[PDB]
Amino acid sequence: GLLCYCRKGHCKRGDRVRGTCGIRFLYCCPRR
């Protein structure tokens, strides 16, 4: 998906990392 989301720990096993989101949260974009 074009829309990226925030996720704790790390991105989904297949997503694309963008950067950091917050305390123990990373900003990534969904594979599908």
- The beta-strand count equals 3
* Percent of sequence in beta strands: over 45%
What value does the Rg take, in angstroms? 8 Å
Helix content: under 10%
**What structural class do the secondary elements suggest?**
mainly beta
Largest sheet, in brief, is: 3 strands, antiparallel
Q: Globular, elongated, flat, extended or rod-shaped: what is the shape?
A: globular
How many helix segments? 0
The overall number of domains is 1
Order of helices and strands: EEE
Strand order of the largest sheet: 1-3-2
- Separation, N- and C-terminal Cα atoms: 5 Å
PDB class: antibiotic
Keywords: triple stranded beta sheet, beta hairpin, antibiotic
Assembly: monomeric
Entry title: High-resolution solution structure of the salt-bridge defficient mouse defensin (E15D)-Cryptdin4
Could you name the key traits of this structure?
32 residues, mainly beta, three-stranded antiparallel sheet, 3 strands, globular, Defensin alpha 4
Describe this structure in words.
- With 32 residues, this protein is mostly beta strands.
- The protein has one domain.
- The protein is 0% helix and 50% strand.
- It contains no helices and 3 strands.
- Strands 1-3-2 form a 3-stranded antiparallel β-sheet, with no helix packed on it.
- β2 and β3 form a beta hairpin.
- It is globular and about 25 Å long.
- It is found in: Secreted; Cytoplasmic vesicle, Secretory vesicle.
- Belongs to the alpha-defensin family.
- Host-defense peptide that has antimicrobial activity. Exhibits activity against Gram-negative E.coli (in vitro). Probably contributes to the antimicrobial barrier function of the small bowel mucosa.
- It comes from Mus musculus (Mouse).
- This is Defensin alpha 4.
